[PDB]
Amino acid sequence: TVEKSVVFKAEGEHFTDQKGNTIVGSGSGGTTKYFRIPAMCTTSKGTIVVFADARHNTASDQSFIDTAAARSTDGGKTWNKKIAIYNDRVNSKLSRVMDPTCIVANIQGRETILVMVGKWNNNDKTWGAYRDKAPDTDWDLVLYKSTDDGVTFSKVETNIHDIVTKNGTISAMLGGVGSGLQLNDGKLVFPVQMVRTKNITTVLNTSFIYSTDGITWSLPSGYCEGFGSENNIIEFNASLVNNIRNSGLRRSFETKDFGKTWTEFPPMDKKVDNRNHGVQGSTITIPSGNKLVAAHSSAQNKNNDYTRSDISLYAHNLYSGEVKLIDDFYPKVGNASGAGYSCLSYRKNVDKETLYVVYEANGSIEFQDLSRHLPVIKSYN
């Protein structure tokens, strides 16, 4: 409901910690240096909540990171900002909570926003390098919830570290990045990515965790293949269908038996090319009369490298398999330090439909209202 705004400004934000002290980052004036990995959830009140890594010192994945949250009640025009989740502060160089996935859901009648992030403290290498232990002792996956429309967040005591430990073949697990979903039966579903222990031949796999209450979670028995593992899931006739990052063409599989076996989903499989290395992308459904349409954002990556230019919106005809570029909403070369991620959010509140996007823009997170494209996306079925 603004057409375009900056949510978090690289070298332009100041945050305080739990005691009220400023967090002196490496940006000019001690600001947070860089923002990455935006996740957006919109509530039934019309409130927009945006999470992102506040990477205080560098754009690097292995650095000092807190999860920042921004809340807008005026359609994305102004943003109220704070830290939603603080890292443990064991190591000032490496302690981090990162890569948010959010869900807005009604759980037993209460509208709740959930945010899940991975947490590390002493690991100095990329998470894919730690495959000895089940799970890695430095890792954890933490879940916070808000029941007051995004204003306060508190930690949820979960059985997630236990189901991973009981599985015995997973070194670490992370959300798929962006947003999860609530199924038509009420269950919460987080798409997940997992690094398997060193003896499993596949390093990475994709799957999901599910819960009825947000507290006790379960893993299905099967695994989808991994590719670039960041992924989202959509519900389509109670198949669950994911859409996975891959170097080159994105992949899409379907489960008809709730996570026991996955087979390629032709309407979305290999339809968008993100070229070299791959990028995270956001995929959601939009109802169109009694049919569904899948809306998707990811980078065109015209330079075929880490600059991941041209973050675009696509519509996927779930019936015919046709794909159409609806809008290249950020038609710029990104910063190779960390670029190209995005998150879509669609909501219809009473009779008002909104389609919003948040994305990485040279270290900052930008917001755009894309609702003007809904007629065109809704026609693709």
Instruction: Look up residue 203 and give its two tokens.
Output: 């390093």
Q: Spot the catalytic one: 13, 360, 366, 369.
A: 360
Q: Which is nearer to ligand DAN, 178 or 267 (CB)?
A: 178
**Which member of 61, 136, 269, 327 binds ligand DAN (CB under 6 A)?**
61
Q: Is 130 in the site for ligand DAN (CB under 6 A)?
A: no
Residue 178: closest CA among 370, 335, 36, 325: 36
Type of residue at 25: G
Total residues contacting ligand DAN by CB under 6 A comes to 10
Strands 96-107 and 178-179 come out as: parallel
Rg (CA), the chain: 19
The one-letter code for the residue type at 4 is: K
36 is in an annotated binding site: yes
Token pair for 370? 């894309």
Rule CB under 6 A: is residue 363 a binding residue for ligand DAN? no
Site string for ligand DAN, 313-352 (x = CB under 6 A): -------------------------x--------------
Active-site annotation holder among 34, 144, 330, 341 = 341
Beta bridge partners of 206: 193, 224
Check binding of 191 to ligand DAN (CB under 6 A).
no
Which of 78, 87, 27 has its CA nearest to residue 50?
Answer: 78
Please confirm, yes or no, whether 3 is among the known catalytic residues.
no
Nearer to ligand DAN, 276 or 288 (CB): 276
Rounded to an integer, what distance in angstroms lies between the CA atom of residue 374 and that of residue 132?
47
In the residue annotation, 319 being an active-site residue is answered as: no
Q: How many residues does the chain have?
A: 381
Of 341 and 346, the one with the shorter C-beta distance to ligand DAN is: 341
Is 366 noted as a catalytic residue in this protein?
no
**DSSP state for residue 197 in the 8-state scheme:** P
DSSP 150-162: TS--EEE--SHHH
Shortest approach of ligand DAN to residue 26 CB, angstroms?
A: 18
CB of 192 to ligand DAN, least distance (A): 12
Strand-pairing partners, residue 104, are: 113
Catalytic residues: 61, 341, 360
Q: Which residues are annotated as a binding site?
A: 36, 245, 308
Interacting residue ranges for ligand DAN, rule: CB under 6 A: 37, 61, 98-99, 118, 126-128, 230, 338
Annotated binding-site members for substrate: 36, 245, 308
